[PDB]
Design a binder for this molecule. Sequence first.
Ligand SMILES: C[As](C)(=O)[O-]
Ligand SMILES: C[As](C)(=O)[O-]
Ligand SMILES: C[As](C)(=O)[O-]
Ligand SMILES: [Zn+2]
Ligand SMILES: [Zn+2]
Ligand SMILES: [Zn+2]
Ligand SMILES: [Zn+2]
Ligand SMILES: [Zn+2]
Ligand SMILES: [Zn+2]
Ligand SMILES: [Zn+2]
Ligand SMILES: [Zn+2]
Ligand SMILES: [Zn+2]
Ligand SMILES: [Zn+2]
Ligand SMILES: [Zn+2]
Ligand SMILES: [Zn+2]
Ligand SMILES: [Zn+2]
Length: 160
Amino acid sequence: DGPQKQQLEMPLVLDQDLTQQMRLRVESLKQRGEKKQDGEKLIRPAESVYRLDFIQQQKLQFDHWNVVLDKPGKVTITGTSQNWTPDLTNLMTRQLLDPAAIFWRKEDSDAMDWNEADALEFGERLSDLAKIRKVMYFLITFGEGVEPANLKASVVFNQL
Ligand SMILES: C[As](C)(=O)[O-]
Ligand SMILES: C[As](C)(=O)[O-]
Ligand SMILES: C[As](C)(=O)[O-]
Ligand SMILES: [Zn+2]
Ligand SMILES: [Zn+2]
Ligand SMILES: [Zn+2]
Ligand SMILES: [Zn+2]
Ligand SMILES: [Zn+2]
Ligand SMILES: [Zn+2]
Ligand SMILES: [Zn+2]
Ligand SMILES: [Zn+2]
Ligand SMILES: [Zn+2]
Ligand SMILES: [Zn+2]
Ligand SMILES: [Zn+2]
Ligand SMILES: [Zn+2]
Ligand SMILES: [Zn+2]
């Protein structure tokens, strides 16, 4: 908009503990032979839980994503209802957001690509979801050839 605005880049960091929580849960149901909680969303092996901590709940405007990969691959960052307390609820399929920001990189080059229109729609939303709580949770789906160790995934906001 304007080349003048202060920007704050906030990293989506790997949430190893809850990722595992979720990983053990899908087990459990296996060893127990119990079914899920009706509309419960079970973390697949290909997904990993990421965390985003909002440094300034207010005055965040969202500006652009800053996601890049090490190898050619694909990733999908599906947001999560800010009403989901991983301390309390079990993530419900319905708690996932629409849409998701899908990013990918093709073989020969280094240039990142994504689903623009959607990555922007989902984006403009973080500026408000920030005012709900200082913690945002996401579920990243890794393609083939990609694993957590190839990704940088911060979100750049504008300071109002
Ligand atoms: C300067 As802008 C269009 O990335 O909010
Ligand atoms: C889901 As937790 C163990 O980071 O409060
Ligand atoms: C071809 As696929 C949708 O199983 O990564
Ligand atoms: Zn944690
Ligand atoms: Zn679960
Ligand atoms: Zn902007
Ligand atoms: Zn592909
Ligand atoms: Zn917790
Ligand atoms: Zn849609
Ligand atoms: Zn494109
Ligand atoms: Zn779409
Ligand atoms: Zn818009
Ligand atoms: Zn819109
Ligand atoms: Zn896959
Ligand atoms: Zn695939
Ligand atoms: Zn393929």
